[PDB]
From TrEMBL:
Residues 37-185, 283-436, 920-1070 form the Duffy-antigen binding domain. It comes from Plasmodium falciparum (isolate 3D7). It comes from the Eukaryota. Disulfide bonds join 291-294, 338-419, 446-561, 460-470, 466-605, 524-528, 614-679, 677-757, 719-739, 857-865, 901-931, 986-1078, 1103-1194, 1117-1124, 1128-1207, 1181-1192. This is Erythrocyte membrane protein 1, PfEMP1. The chain holds residues 43 to 1977 of 3056 of the full protein.
Amino acid sequence: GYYRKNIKITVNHDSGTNDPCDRPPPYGCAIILSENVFVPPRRQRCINNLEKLNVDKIRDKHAFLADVLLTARNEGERIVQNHPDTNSSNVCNALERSFADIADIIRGTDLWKGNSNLEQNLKQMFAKIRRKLREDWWNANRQKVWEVITCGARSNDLLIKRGCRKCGHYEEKVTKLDYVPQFLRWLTEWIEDFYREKQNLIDDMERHREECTCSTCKDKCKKYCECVKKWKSEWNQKNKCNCNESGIASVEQEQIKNNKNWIWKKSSGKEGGQKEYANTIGLPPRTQSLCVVCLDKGKKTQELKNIRTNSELLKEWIIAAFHEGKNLKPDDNGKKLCKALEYSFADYGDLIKGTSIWDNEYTKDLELNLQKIFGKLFRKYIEQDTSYLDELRESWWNTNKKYIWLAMKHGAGMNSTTCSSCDDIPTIDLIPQYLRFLQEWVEHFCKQRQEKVKPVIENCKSCKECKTECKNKCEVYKKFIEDCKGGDGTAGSSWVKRWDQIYKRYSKYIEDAKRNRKAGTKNCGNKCVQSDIDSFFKHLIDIGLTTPSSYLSIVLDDNICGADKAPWTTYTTYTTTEKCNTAVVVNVPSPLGNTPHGYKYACQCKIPTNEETCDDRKEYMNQWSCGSDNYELCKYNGVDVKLDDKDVTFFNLFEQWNKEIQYQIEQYMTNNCKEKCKCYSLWIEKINDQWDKQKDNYNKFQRKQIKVVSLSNFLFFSCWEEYIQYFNGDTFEFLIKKCGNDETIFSEKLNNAEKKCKENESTKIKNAIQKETELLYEYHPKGFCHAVQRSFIDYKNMILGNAWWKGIEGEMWDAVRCAITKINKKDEDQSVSWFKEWSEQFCIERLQYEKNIRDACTDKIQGDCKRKCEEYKKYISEKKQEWDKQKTKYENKYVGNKSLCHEGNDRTWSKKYIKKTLEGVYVPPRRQQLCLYELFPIIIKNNDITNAKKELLETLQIVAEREAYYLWKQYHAHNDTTYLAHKKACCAIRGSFYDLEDIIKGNDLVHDEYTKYIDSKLNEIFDSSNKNDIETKRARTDWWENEAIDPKTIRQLVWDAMQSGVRKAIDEEKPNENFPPCMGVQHIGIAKPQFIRWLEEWTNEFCEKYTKYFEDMKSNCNLSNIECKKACANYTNWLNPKRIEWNGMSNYYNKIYRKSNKESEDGKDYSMIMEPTVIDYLNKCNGEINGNYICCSCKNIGEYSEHKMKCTEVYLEHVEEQLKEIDNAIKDY
């Protein structure tokens, strides 16, 4: 609900900026040593937020619902964190009592609270919506209110629901039915409070009377007796070792019977389970058969509920563990029994300390009895060393985990010296139960997979007809892997779906642990990460194990899942043939693959073809299907076909093919060698066949149309258009050099590709040259190739006044080598080389002048420093004088807190600077025009580490401010000033801030000179006397999101700098604008990966451009050769680069999703994105722009068969007139 609020189904916060819950000591019968408002309980509230409900948003009941749910959520959190009962049933009862209290508040039937001016506030809303209606409203929203109130309840909370888990949060029926009048409810809560106070006083004097002596306790009991009598008098108003002595709190420190089957459903009536963990993790068969009912399989000897001392509790637990040991009695004791005992011991641990995620209709009773026992036993422990109930359970388990382990060992026959019993206690119990269940399930699946794959690997390894050697066994393996029935591992589903559910739950843990800014990891109490799920997953994120794939790769054994090395990291792709229906491509880890790893196109009894190897090498791809009097269409693999229609469709396909093939050839010109150019020559043959087919097709087009320009004319037009669309809107010679003048160009390009393969696969004056080399050596060496090439080319130019020149050049290497041996005894190359030598000389001279001016300079500095500054300025001016001429000559040869920075609306953007593998990454223009000018001075200073950090923080602040100001000014400089422009500028500012964060954290994909110098200097700055890449990349990270420096860390500090910049933008440029709600949220979530943000920005920009262009065409065209052609050319010109960019981005995204830091490329997280394809991810763009959670607002893409004929026919006319312009373009020169 868009309200001072953001977009709130699970937990609110968010309609709370108006009035807080404060007025107020939380209430958790006052003790006496030796008003008539007694009817209301101890808890008087939680109410102030709902109080004075007269905000302008009262015409909609949804605002009232949001406010009441916020109040209920805050009340529930207060009760959960407040009520000191150490009993989940009592906490649930208190939550239900508060729910009934707010029920009577909203219904307003029996409202008796000592607040003023509340009933009128409620009646205002209930008359705007317009007391029976109030009751109907409550009976309608009861379910939602009870869902929101118990959100903060602990996971191991029990509800009696007499009329269960987590205070009845998950019941699909409100649970307790409190329709009773609050008079009896308050009386019941009062008597409960008195009884609880009596037991509290008993617990107090248990450690007081026995130690201090007595009489004072009896006096207090007497006083409470008269207090109770005084209360009841007014009640005419009724008519209206081996124990917990040690106390060890272990801290984690980790570095890099009946029928039983795997149950995955929710907690059923009597078998398996929790509701939250349903259909996302499977109970192992052992975990359901833990022998507490194992007293004698029932109770005949002695009742469980007789634990007077914790010694009895330990005895009972020891007996249970010992009887568990005998259940696994049938070497196995090193790999099977040891692991089984480890998992059973961890299960006991995680069910004693209230971490179990499974239910067996005895776990409820066991948990309730354990809570009662711990409450009645340990009271003094529940000055923060002796005093801690969950921490009490964890400490008790850690103090007595050794005896349970020994008991189960002696019960399994595993007596001693096995898996003096030195360091025998497992560390497995520390990791969360979900990870243990995942590992057990995966190792079971591996056992089955190895059993089913051993015949395959032992049969057709020679091929790494065929009756049953390998055709049949691989069929059995495929049936095992691909079957909707699943198998023993699953519970009625395919392995892929179960793995997807596991991945979803693991990613939910990863995101939940990453969002919690609470200290988590790195809390010294060495590292000493505390015993919590969030801390453990923070540690896993710090390692990089952010996916089940990599985690299982690093925790599982080796050669456990098959004789073929099937890694859990290398994802493999396959097309399903079973129901798992439609042929959907699936990417899964190698053990879950369709066929054994490395046996693709080798199990079908076929030699691996070179074409297949190139097709599965993911390199040198030409995505063109080449399906075919009729036109031999070069149909694309992705989309299929949907003046006549045939020739125009062929023309569009031919134009797209021409553009994409030219781009691919140019890229491969820009871009072990044996198979490399085997695939390269295959690609060359494919594109040559495509070119021949397209030549034939264009001949057919010309002979059938009857005119259209010739083929060469169309290619010349294409060359001109691709030149114009960098030089939008010298050049003459460059165009002559690139393409011809008044079809051969592809012949030359393919010849160039072939010779590039050949080169790659293969790989007096005559004395004056050595004299000059010796002289230059004696001058000093660095960069001698430039000197020798310049001298030789100059001498050649003088002597000449074409293999002969090449022969002379190649013959004189021997002279240079002879000169080298003698001294041991004791882009073109005419102006570009001169430019590079001049640049190197300038760089060296300027670096020397840097220290020359830094000598006596480092407030304003005068004296000697001004002389050096004046000389440096004179040198800079003199060098720039020649730099202008050098740049002009280079371009003529070929073109291919204030601050001094520019503001430039550039709409085109392609890949030019990426670290690179990194294929299909295109940097958005907003990030390309990022202002890092002011960031260079502050780190040129190279002086003190603390001063360097302070100055870097200041410069980051000013850069963020200027970037935000320019972004807001640039977006609103147009005619539009509505809310849409505000949201667009908000999203752009957020993206820029994320890009700054990634540059600081060193995760940016850009690799140009700016970021190169920035991260090169920052690596030196953030070196803590060590050169570890991980250590420095985490030291530059914790300075950002963990350096508090009232505590306003660097992230919110830079965000406030952006806010100040946008306020400066607002406060300068209808009569009075206000601060947008998005900009003032002051809360920023975890940033999505750089590529994903870039992809969303591309989608938003492309959708906006399509909406603008298509609407323009719908008016100009569809009734004309000077106005409709403009829209036609505008729409066609920008589509092809978008086609190429989308193809590259999709190709990249196909190898990103479901990857971790280790198994992916460039070592980025990339784990949170899990959608199958790029379209399936961008589909989850729907909706308008709002704040941060949504940035893309694409809509109305499909619903164009119309405006095709007219757009193409004018395009041909546009080509003819441009080629007629040759009369004044190339004819005269």
